[PDB]
Amino acid sequence: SFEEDPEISLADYWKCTSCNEMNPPLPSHCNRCWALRENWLPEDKG
Ligand SMILES: [Zn+2]
Hints:
CATH class: Mainly Beta
Keywords: phosphorylation, UBL conjugation pathway
Bound molecules: zinc ion
Name: ubiquitin-protein ligase E3 MDM2
Radius of gyration: 12 Å
Helix content: under 10%
CATH architecture: Roll
Entry title: Solution structure of the C4 zinc-finger domain of HDM2
Shape: flat
PDB class: ligase
Assembly: monomeric
Order of helices and strands: EE
């Protein structure tokens, strides 16, 4: 199922490393197990 989403395409989604679920960029944790993403915010070590 795909709908009009030019502002937020499903391609921008992410893959929860816990269960391997797909989620949008809006949230951070998987919408099932709540596997709060790890690599989201701008990670700039140094
Ligand atoms: Zn998950």
